Amino acid sequence: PGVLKIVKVYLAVKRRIQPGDKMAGRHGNKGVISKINPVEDMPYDENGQP
């Protein structure tokens, strides 16, 4: 009662990973991302895969 018109708008937001987001496995090891490090600063194996 008393309502004339309802307009509903749906917004799609793409949320990327960033520091502060909670990420976890299946064994109870949860954590918060602290840094988005560059690829060149990651440890790499003998084949160069970081």
Binding site: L4, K5, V7, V9, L11
Partner: protein, 49 residues
């Protein structure tokens, strides 16, 4: 009075009305950021001192 949905929004420039249609509702597929008008609504207001 009765609140009306329209594109004639007082004290708002044409920049914020770009994504609105004639009916006052944002287009489908419009990329909107914070503070952008999606539905333009105007409500009658009483005398203000």
């Amino acid at each position: 009075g009765a609140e009306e949905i329209t594109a004639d929004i007082p004290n708002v420039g044409e920049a914020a009305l770009s994504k609105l249609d004639e009916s006052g509702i944002v287009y489908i597929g419009a990329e909107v950021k914070g503070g952008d008008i999606l539905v333009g609504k105007v409500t009658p207001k009483g005398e203000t001192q």
